Short mmCIF file of C-alpha atoms in Angstrom, two decimals:
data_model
loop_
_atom_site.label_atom_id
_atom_site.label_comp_id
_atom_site.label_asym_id
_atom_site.label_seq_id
_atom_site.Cartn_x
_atom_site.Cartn_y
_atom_site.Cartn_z
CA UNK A 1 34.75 -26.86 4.91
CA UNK A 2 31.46 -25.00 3.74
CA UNK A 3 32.67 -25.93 0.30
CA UNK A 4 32.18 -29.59 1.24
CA UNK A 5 28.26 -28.29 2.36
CA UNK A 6 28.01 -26.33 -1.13
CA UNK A 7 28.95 -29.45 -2.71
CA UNK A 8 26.70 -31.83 -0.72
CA UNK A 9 23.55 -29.62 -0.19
CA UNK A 10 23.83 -28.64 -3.93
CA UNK A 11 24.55 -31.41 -6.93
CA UNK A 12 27.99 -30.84 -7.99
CA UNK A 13 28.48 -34.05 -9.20
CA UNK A 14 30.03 -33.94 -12.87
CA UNK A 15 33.11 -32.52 -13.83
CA UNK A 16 30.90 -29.46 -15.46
CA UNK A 17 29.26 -28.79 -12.61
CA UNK A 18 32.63 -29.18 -10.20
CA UNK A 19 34.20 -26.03 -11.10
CA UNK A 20 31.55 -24.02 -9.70
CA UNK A 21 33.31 -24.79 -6.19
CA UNK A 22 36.62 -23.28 -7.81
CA UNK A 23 35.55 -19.62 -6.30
CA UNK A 24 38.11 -17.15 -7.76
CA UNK A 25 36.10 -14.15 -7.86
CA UNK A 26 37.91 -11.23 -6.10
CA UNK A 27 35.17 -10.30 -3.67
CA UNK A 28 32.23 -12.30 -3.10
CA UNK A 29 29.36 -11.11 -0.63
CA UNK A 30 27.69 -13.91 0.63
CA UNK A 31 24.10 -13.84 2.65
CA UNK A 32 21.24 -15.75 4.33
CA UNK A 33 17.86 -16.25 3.58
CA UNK A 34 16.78 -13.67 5.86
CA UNK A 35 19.11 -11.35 3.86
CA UNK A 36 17.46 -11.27 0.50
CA UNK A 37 15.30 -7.93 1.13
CA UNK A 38 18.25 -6.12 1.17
CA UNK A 39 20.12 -7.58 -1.27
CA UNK A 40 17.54 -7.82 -4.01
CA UNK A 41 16.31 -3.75 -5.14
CA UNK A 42 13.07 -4.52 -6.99
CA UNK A 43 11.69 -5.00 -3.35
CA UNK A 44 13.57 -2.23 -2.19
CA UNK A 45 17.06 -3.57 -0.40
CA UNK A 46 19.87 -0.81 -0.49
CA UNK A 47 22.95 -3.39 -1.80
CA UNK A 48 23.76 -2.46 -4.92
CA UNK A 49 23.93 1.01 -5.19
CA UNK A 50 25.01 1.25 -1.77
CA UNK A 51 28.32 -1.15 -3.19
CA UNK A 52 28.20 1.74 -5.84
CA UNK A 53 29.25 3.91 -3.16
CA UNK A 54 32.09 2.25 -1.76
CA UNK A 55 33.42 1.85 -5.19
CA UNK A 56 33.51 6.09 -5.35
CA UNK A 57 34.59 6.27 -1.76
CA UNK A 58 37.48 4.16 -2.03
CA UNK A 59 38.87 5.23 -5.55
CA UNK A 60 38.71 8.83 -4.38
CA UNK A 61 40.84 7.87 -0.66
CA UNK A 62 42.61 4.95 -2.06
CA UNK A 63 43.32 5.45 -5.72
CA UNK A 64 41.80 2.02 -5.87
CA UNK A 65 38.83 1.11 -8.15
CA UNK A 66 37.56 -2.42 -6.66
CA UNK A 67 36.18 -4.71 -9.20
CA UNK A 68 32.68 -6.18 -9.83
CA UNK A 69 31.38 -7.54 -6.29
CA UNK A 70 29.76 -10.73 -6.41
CA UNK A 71 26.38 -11.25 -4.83
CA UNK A 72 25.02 -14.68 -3.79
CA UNK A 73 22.60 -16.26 -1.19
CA UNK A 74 23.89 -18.79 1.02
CA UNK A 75 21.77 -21.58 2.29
CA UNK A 76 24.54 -22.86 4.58
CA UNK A 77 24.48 -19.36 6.35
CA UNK A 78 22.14 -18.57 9.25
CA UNK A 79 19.15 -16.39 7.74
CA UNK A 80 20.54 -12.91 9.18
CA UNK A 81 24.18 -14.46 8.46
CA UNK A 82 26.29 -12.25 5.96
CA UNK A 83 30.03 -13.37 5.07
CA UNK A 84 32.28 -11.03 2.65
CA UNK A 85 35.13 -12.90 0.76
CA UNK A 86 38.15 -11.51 -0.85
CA UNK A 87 40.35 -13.06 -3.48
CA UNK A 88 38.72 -16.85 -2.18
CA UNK A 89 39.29 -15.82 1.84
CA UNK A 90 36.93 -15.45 4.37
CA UNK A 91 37.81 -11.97 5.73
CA UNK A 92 34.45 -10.85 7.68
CA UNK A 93 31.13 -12.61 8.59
CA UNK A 94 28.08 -10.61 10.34
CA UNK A 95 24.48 -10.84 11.44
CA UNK A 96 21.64 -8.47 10.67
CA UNK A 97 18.36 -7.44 11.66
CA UNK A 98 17.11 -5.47 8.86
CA UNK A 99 13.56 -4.41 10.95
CA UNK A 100 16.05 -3.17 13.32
CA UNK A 101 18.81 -0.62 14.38
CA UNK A 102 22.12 -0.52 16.31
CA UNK A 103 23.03 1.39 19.53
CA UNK A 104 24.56 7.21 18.11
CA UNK A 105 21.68 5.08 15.55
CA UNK A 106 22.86 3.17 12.98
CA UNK A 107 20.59 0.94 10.69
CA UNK A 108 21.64 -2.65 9.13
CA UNK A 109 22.48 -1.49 5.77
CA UNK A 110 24.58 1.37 6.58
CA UNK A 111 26.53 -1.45 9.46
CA UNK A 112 26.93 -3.71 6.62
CA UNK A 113 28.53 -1.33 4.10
CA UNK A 114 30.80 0.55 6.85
CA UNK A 115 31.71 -3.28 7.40
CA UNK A 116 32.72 -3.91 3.78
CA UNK A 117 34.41 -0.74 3.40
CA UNK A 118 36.72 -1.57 6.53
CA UNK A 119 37.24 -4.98 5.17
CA UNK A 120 38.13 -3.84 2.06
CA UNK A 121 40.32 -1.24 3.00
CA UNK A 122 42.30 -3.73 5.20
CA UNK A 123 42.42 -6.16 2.55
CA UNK A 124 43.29 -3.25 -0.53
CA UNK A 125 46.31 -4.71 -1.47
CA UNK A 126 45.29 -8.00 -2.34
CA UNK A 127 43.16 -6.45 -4.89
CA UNK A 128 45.09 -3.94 -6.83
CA UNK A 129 45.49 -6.86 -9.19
CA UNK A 130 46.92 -6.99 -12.97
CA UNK A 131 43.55 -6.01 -14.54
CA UNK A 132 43.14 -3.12 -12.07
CA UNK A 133 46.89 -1.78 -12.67
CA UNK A 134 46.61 -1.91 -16.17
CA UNK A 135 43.34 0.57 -15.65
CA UNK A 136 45.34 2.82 -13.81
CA UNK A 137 48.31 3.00 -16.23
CA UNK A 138 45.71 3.28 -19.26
CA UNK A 139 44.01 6.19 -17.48
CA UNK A 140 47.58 7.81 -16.72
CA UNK A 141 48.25 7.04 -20.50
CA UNK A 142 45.95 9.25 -21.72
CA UNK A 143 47.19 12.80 -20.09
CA UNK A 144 50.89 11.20 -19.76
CA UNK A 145 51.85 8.99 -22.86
CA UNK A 146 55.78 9.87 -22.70
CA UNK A 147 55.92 9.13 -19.06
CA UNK A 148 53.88 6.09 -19.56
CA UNK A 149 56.30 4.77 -21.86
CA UNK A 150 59.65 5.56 -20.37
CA UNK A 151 58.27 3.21 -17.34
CA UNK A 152 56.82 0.28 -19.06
CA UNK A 153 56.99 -2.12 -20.31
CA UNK A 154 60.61 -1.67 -20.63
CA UNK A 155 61.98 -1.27 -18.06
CA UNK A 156 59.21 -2.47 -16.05
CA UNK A 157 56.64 -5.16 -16.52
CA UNK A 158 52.86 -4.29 -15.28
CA UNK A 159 53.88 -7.17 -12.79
CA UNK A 160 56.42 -4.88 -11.57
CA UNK A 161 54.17 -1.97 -10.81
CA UNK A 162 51.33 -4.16 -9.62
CA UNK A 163 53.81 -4.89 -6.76
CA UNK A 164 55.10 -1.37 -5.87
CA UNK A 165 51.05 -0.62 -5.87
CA UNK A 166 50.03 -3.26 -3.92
CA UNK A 167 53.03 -2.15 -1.13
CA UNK A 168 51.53 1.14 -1.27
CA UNK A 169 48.15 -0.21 -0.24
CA UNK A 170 49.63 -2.46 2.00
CA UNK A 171 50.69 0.55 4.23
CA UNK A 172 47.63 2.34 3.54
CA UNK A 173 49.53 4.92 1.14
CA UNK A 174 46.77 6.07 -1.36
CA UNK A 175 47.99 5.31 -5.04
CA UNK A 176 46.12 8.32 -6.35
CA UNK A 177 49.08 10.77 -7.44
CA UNK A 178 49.58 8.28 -10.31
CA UNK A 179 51.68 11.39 -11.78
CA UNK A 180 54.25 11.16 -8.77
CA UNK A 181 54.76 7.50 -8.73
CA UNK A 182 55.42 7.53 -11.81
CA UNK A 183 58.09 10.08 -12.05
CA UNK A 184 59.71 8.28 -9.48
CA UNK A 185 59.62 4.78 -11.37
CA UNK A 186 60.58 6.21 -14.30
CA UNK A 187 63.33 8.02 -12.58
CA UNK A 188 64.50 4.58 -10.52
CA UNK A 189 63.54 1.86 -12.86
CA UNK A 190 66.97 1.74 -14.85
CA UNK A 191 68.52 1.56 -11.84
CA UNK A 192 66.93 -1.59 -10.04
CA UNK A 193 63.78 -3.54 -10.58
CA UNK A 194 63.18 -4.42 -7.33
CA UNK A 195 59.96 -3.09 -6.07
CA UNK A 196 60.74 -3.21 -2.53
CA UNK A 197 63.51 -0.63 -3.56
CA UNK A 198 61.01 0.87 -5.78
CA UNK A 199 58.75 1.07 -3.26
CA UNK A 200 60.85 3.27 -0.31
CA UNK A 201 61.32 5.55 -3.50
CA UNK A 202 58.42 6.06 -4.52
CA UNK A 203 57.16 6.42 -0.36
CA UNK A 204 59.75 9.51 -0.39
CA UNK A 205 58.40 11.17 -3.54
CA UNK A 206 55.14 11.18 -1.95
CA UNK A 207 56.58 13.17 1.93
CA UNK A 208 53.59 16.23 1.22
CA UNK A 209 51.18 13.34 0.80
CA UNK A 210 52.21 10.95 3.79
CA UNK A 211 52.70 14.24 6.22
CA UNK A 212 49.32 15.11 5.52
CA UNK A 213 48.05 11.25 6.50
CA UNK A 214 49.40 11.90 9.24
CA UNK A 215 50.44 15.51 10.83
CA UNK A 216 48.05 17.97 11.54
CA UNK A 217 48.51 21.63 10.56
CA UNK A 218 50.69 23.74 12.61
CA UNK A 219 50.56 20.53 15.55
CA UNK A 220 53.56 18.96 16.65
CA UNK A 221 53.01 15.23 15.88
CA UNK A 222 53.47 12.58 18.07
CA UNK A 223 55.95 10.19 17.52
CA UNK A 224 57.66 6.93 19.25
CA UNK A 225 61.64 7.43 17.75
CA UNK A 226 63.92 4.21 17.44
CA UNK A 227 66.72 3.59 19.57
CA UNK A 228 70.61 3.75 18.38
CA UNK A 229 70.86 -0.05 19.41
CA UNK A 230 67.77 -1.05 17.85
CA UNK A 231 68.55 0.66 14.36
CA UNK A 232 72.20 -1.14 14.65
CA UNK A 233 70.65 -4.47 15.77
CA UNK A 234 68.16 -4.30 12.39
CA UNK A 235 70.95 -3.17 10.05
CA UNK A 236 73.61 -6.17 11.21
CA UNK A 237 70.69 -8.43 10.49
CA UNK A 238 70.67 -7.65 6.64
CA UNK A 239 71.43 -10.33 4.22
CA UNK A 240 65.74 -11.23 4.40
CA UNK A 241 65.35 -9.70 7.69
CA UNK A 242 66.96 -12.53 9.68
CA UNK A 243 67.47 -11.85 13.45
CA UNK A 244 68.00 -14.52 16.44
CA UNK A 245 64.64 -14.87 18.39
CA UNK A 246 65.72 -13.39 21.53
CA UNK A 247 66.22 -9.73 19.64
CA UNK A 248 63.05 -9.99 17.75
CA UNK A 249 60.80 -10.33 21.08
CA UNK A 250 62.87 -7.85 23.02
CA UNK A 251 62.18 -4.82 19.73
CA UNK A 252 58.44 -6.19 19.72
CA UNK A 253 57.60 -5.23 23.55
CA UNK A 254 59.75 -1.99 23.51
CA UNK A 255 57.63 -0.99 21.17
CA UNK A 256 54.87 -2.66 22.61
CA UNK A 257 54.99 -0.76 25.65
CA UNK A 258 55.51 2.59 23.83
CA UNK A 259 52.58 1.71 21.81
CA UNK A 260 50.37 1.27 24.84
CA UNK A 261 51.42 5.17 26.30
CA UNK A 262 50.10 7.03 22.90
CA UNK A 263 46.75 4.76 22.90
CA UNK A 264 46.19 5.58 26.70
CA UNK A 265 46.45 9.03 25.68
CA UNK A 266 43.78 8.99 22.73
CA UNK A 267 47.11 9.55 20.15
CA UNK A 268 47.22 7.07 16.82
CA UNK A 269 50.86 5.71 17.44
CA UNK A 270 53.35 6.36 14.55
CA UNK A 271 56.82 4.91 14.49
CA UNK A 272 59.96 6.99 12.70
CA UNK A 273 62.91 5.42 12.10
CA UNK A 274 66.09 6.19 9.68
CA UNK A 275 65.69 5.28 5.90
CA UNK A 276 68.10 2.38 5.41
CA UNK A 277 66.28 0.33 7.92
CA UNK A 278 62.51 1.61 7.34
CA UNK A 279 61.18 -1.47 5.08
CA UNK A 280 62.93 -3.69 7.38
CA UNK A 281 61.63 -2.52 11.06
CA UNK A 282 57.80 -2.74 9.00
CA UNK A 283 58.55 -6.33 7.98
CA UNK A 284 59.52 -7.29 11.68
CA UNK A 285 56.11 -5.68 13.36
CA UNK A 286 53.89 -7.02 10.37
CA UNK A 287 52.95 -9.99 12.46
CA UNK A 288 53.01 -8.26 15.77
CA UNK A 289 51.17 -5.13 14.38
CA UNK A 290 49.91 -4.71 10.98
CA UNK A 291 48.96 -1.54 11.37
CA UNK A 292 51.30 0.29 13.53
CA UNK A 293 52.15 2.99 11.21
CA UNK A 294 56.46 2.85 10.32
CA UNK A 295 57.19 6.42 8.70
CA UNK A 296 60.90 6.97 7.67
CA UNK A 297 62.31 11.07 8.35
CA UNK A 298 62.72 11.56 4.66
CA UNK A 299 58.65 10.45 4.58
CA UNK A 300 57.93 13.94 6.86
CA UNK A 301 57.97 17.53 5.16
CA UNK A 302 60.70 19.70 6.55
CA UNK A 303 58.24 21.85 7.99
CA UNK A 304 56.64 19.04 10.19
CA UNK A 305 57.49 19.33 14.38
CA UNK A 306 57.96 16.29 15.40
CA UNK A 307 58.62 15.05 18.68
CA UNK A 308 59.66 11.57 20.68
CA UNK A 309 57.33 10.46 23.71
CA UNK A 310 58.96 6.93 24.31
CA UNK A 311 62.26 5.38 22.21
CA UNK A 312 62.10 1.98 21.08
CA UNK A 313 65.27 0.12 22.79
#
């Protein structure tokens, strides 16, 4: 739709010119008129090193090293109008006042990049991408050659790894014990290719890692539990999660309403459930709630207290 005003208020007329509208960058920051003082650094304008930053921030949480962010004025946008795209999507759009501040004191530059940070955090998955994997198995080459090798490309592709990566993001597992999930795929990848599979492996061999996302030292965590009848219920439907649209509503409020209690409480609500049916009770809530966090038991340290304030049913 604001291609079609690209198009029109530009000249993209010829077939040389057309492919311009064919945006494939992987993240594209996109700005008013009234947005060019910080976005252009010989008149001062904090942008580009403060993108620097989030580059740092998020390879050191995430394990993720986001690529070259493209920077472009918009015409089409209002002049404090900024709009961040990932991988061709809209994913965030803003206003600033750059003479100004926001109400504890924040000013515009600082909003913008906590913005973009958040956005790409939520979005991390879509960008661990075939150029960035191959980085990160290159890198691991280096100290790890032999372990390298046993994994890839025989008997699995960089395509395969990009996946179990990008379902590591997904969840908001950091990918930065390259050592570990390696181990792990080199230890599975005879056995199955299938990076869902490879995935719930890999999620175990990295328990200290997860329990430390999560569970604080020496506190008893807590945790909504799943019910008998709801683990069955998930299990029969196995083929590919397919369930009869009656069940699926009835799991989403129990949880739903067990959700609500840890929230009212100031608690981030975390959701264990057996390992058989993990990956499959995640795929159900993805559309309900992305980010409800679904740990399996063999995902907690032995050493972790943890204790059930409502069951799912």
């Amino acid at each position: 739709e604001i291609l079609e005003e690209e198009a029109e208020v530009d000249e993209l007329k010829s077939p040389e010119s057309v492919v311009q509208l064919l945006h494939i960058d992987p993240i594209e920051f996109e700005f008013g008129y009234g947005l060019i003082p910080l976005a252009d650094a010989n008149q001062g304008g904090d942008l580009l090193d403060r993108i620097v930053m989030i580059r740092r921030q998020l390879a050191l949480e995430l394990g993720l090293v986001i690529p070259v962010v493209r920077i472009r004025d918009n015409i089409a946008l209002q002049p404090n109008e900024y709009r961040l795209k990932i991988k061709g999507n809209e994913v965030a759009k803003g206003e600033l006042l750059l003479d100004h501040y926001l109400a504890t004191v924040v000013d515009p530059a600082s909003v913008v990049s906590t913005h973009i940070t958040e956005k790409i955090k939520q979005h991390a998955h879509e960008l661990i991408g075939r150029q960035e994997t191959k980085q990160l198995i290159d890198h691991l080459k280096e100290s790890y050659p032999v372990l390298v090798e046993e994994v890839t490309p025989n008997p699995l592709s960089v395509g395969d790894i990009q996946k179990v990566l990008a379902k590591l993001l997904k969840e908001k597992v950091s990918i930065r014990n390259l050592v570990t999930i390696f181990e792990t795929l080199a230890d599975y990848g005879k056995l199955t290719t299938d990076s869902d599979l490879l995935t719930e492996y890999t999620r175990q061999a990295l328990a200290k890692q997860i329990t430390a996302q999560f569970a604080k030292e020496n506190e008893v965590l807590k945790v909504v539990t799943c019910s008998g009848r709801v683990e069955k219920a998930i299990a029969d439907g196995v083929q590919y999660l397919s369930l009869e649209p009656d069940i699926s509503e009835s799991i989403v409020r129990s949880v739903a309403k067990e959700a609500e209690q840890l929230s009212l409480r100031q608690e981030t609500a975390i959701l264990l459930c057996s390992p058989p049916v993990r990956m499959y009770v995640k795929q159900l809530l993805e559309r309900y709630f992305p980010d409800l966090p679904v740990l399996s038991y063999n995902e907690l340290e032995a050493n972790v207290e943890v204790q059930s304030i409502g069951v799912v049913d």
